[PDB]
Design a binder for these strands. Structure first.
Ligand SMILES: [Mn+2]
Ligand SMILES: [Mn+2]
Ligand code: NA
Length: 344
DNA sequence: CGCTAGTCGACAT
DNA sequence: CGACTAGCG
């Protein structure tokens, strides 16, 4: 996510209870619940031994949401973004490393280091996610598998008015331009809420409370799509965007050293990287649940060419997109692993 | 003051 | 993932 963002816009948050959204619709970044629950049965999961504790763990939160008259829409991550393959597979390397090393630490009796290794080897698979999907759908809870990152799908669901709030632990949702984000929610319904409108409460932001400038700030400070320039954090990026009311962000980036009074050299790789990052935050492919088709998060502008946004996602047939979104088609093998029908 | 790289906790007994 | 902090510009 956006490192340090929560403490940076700390003044835009407030302690709430989900009772506020009684009789409303709320989408959930289920992976947080999935991972948090996978922590408990980390040993058995990493060993390959059968376990289903994380399912019940998620269903705790689900039932808690249902008890307050809240309609939850569980969202799951789908295909890995074509650009983020490297980072993900490297994460896989680290996980496998902690697994094998953890087992070697089990050979030596080091139980604490072992557990701490196995808990850092947690790989949330699509099988686990689908198990959670079945569990929720048996309780009448809608589930949706995002075409790619669940973040963009949630952002769309909130922007479209389909849901009123987003439950997550990842600050990326704020960079995608969510209206209401519920953070740090326990199994009882206590959590922090960050509304976009109240971004103005943060004096540090200045005039950088507009979605475009906010996105620019998040990207410049360093995001999942692009590493920041050395010595650039949230404050200095915010300062760059504050001092520069120039709409053309590229020219602004090129003379960042002028605004920060530092000696910074900007490679073209960072310019193109910024453009691709912004295009990924703006036009990452999501699934319209109503019209049942693949659409960009935001509508394509006249200045952007959709034929050059392969890194933001790739289009498939709407029927296939529907089968993937329903979780009936496997992400990797494209095989029918289920046959759920929401029209019965 | 701000930024970076790193550590540590999460669950739950 | 974030919270948190030593080390440094
Ligand atoms: Mn995500
Ligand atoms: Mn994210
Ligand atoms: Na940074």
């Amino acid at each position: 996510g956006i490192q340090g963002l929560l403490q940076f816009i700390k003044e835009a948050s407030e302690p709430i209870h989900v009772r506020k959204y009684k009789g409303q619709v709320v989408a959930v970044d289920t992976y947080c619940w999935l991972h948090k629950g996978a922590i408990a049965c980390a040993e058995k999961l990493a060993k390959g031994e059968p376990t289903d504790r994380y399912v019940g763990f998620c269903m705790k939160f689900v039932n808690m949401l249902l008890s307050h008259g809240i309609k939850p829409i569980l969202v799951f991550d789908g295909c890995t973004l074509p650009s983020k393959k490297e980072v993900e597979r490297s994460r896989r390397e680290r996980r496998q490393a902690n697994l094998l090393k953890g087992k070697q630490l089990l050979r030596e009796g080091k139980v604490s280091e072992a557990r701490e290794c196995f808990t850092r080897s947690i790989n949330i698979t699509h099988a686990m996610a689908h198990k959670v999907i079945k569990a929720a759908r048996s309780q009448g809870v809608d589930c949706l598998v995002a075409p790619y990152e669940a973040d963009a799908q949630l952002a769309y669901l909130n922007k479209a008015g389909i849901v009123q709030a987003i439950i997550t632990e990842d600050s990326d949702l704020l960079a995608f331009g969510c209206k209401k984000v519920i953070l740090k929610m326990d199994q009882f319904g206590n959590g922090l809420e960050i509304d976009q409108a109240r971004l103005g409460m943060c004096r540090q932001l200045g005039d950088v409370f507009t979605e475009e400038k906010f996105r620019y700030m998040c990207i410049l400070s360093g995001c999942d799509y692009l590493s920041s320039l050395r010595g650039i954090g949230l404050a200095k990026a915010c300062k760059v965007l504050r001092l520069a009311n120039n709409p053309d962000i590229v020219k602004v980036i090129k003379k960042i050293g002028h605004y920060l009074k530092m000696n910074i050299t900007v490679p073209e790789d960072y310019i193109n990287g910024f453009i691709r990052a912004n295009n990924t935050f703006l036009y990452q492919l999501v699934f319209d649940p109503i019209k049942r088709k693949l659409i960009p998060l935001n509508a394509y502008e006249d200045d952007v060419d959709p034929e050059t946004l392969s890194y933001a996602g790739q289009y498939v047939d709407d029927s296939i997109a529907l089968q993937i979104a329903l979780g009936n088609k496997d992400i990797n093998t494209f095989e029918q692993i289920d046959d759920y029908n929401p029209d019965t």
